[PDB]
Amino acid sequence: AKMRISPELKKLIEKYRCVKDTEGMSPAKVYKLVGENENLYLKMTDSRYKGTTYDVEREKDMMLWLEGKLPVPKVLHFERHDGWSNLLMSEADGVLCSEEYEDEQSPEKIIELYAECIRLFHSIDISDCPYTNSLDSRLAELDYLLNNDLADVDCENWEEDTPFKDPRELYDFLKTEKPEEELVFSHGDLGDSNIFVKDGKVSGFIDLGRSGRADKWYDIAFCVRSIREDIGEEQYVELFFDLLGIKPDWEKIKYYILLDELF
Numbered sequence: 001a002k003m004r005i006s007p008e009l010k011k012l013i014e015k016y017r018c019v020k021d022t023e024g025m026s027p028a029k030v031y032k033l034v035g036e037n038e039n040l041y042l043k044m045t046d047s048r049y050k051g052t053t054y055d056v057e058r059e060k061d062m063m064l065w066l067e068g069k070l071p072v073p074k075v076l077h078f079e080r081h082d083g084w085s086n087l088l089m090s091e092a093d094g095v096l097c098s099e100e101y102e103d104e105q106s107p108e109k110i111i112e113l114y115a116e117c118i119r120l121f122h123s124i125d126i127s128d129c130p131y132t133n134s135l136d137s138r139l140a141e142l143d144y145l146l147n148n149d150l151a152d153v154d155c156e157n158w159e160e161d162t163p164f165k166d167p168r169e170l171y172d173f174l175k176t177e178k179p180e181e182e183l184v185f186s187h188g189d190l191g192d193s194n195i196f197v198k199d200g201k202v203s204g205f206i207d208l209g210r211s212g213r214a215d216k217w218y219d220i221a222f223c224v225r226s227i228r229e230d231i232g233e234e235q236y237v238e239l240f241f242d243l244l245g246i247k248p249d250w251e252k253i254k255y256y257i258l259l260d261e262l263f
């Protein structure tokens with residue numbers, strides 16, 4: 001078994017009214033620390049995932065590295081207590097993108113924000129980026145996640161696409177169709193649930209576990225995925241690409257989409 005938080009962190013959480021999140025489909029625990037002067041956010045991952053891209057210990061390193069680079073939360077407190085990586089952070093600036101256009105019907109504005117993140121990422125210098133997440137490192141991690149049954153291979157939200165009938169089939173296809181990689185700055189989980197906007201621009205990025213070096217089509221692929229499922233009109237997928245000023249590599253896009261199927 002295990003535990004949770006330390007005494008120190010048990011003080012702050014007591015001082016703020018705590019509310020338990022339910023927006024994190026991940027193995028992490030997320031709590032909002034409602035406060036009088038502000039709100040703080042606590043996120044915790046158990047040992048089983050240490051060293052993995054879910055380990056907040058890593059999300060924290062990356063969160064520290066983006067200071068003065070991208071709009072990310074401020075690392076307040078971090079600790080390893082009872083085989084748990086606990087991160088205390090400040091409340092992202094802005095509104096959740098999913099809740100800024102929740103009613104939606106502002107397709108082009110979403111497409112803009114997505115395309116804005118992309119251009120933005122292709123600005124962060126990865127000369128000193130802490131982690132490299134090339135397919136090699138990622139297929140490595142996946143394999144590992146499967147061997148230790150650390151991944152949900154039964155009840156996930158598959159894409160209606162995934163041509164495969166079992167986990168290893170997919171793994172194999174990935175480990176076998178690896179596109180060439182042009183390393184840029186990758187978020188690792190670009191989606192309206194992990195992005196914050198304000199007054200019309202992006203004002204915050206959170207959920208930075210797989211943040212680091214990675215092919216450029218990785219994030220783009222994700223935006224395509226979201227765009228398609230949430231708007232469902234090839235029309236705005238094209239527009240997205242027009243705003244990016246790039247031609248779609250449907251092979252890479254598909255590929256990278258699949259790579260996320262088991263995470």
Ligand SMILES: NC[C@@H]1O[C@H](O[C@H]2[C@@H](O)[C@H](O[C@@H]3[C@@H](O)[C@H](N)C[C@H](N)[C@H]3O[C@H]3O[C@H](CN)[C@@H](O)[C@H](O)[C@H]3N)O[C@@H]2CO)[C@H](N)[C@@H](O)[C@@H]1O
Pocket residue numbers: 025026098156157158159189191192193194229230260261262263
């Ligand atoms: N939070 C966004 C809200 O939830 C859905 O979006 C979610 C959904 O599309 C997408 O879920 C995708 C699936 O698709 C894809 N086929 C497999 C991939 N494992 C899964 O990933 C999801 O589960 C992971 C853990 N297994 C989490 O680590 C990750 O944060 C989350 N993106 O990620 C979004 C969560 O962020 C609604 N579609 C959207 O309209 C609504 O706004």
Ligand SMILES: Nc1ncnc2c1ncn2[C@@H]1O[C@H](COP(=O)(O)OP(=O)(O)O)[C@@H](O)[C@H]1O
Pocket residue numbers: 021023024025026027028030041043073089090091092096193194206207208
């Ligand atoms: N620093 C933060 N500021 C504001 N909201 C946050 C912050 N950290 C987490 N959240 C909220 O809680 C949810 C879960 O956080 P996230 O890191 O995305 O967990 P998971 O990796 O499970 O998706 C986010 O979608 C967001 O609603």
Ligand SMILES: [Mg+2]
Pocket residue numbers: 023024193194207
């Ligand atoms: Mg999230």
Ligand SMILES: [Mg+2]
Pocket residue numbers: 026189207209
């Ligand atoms: Mg996550």
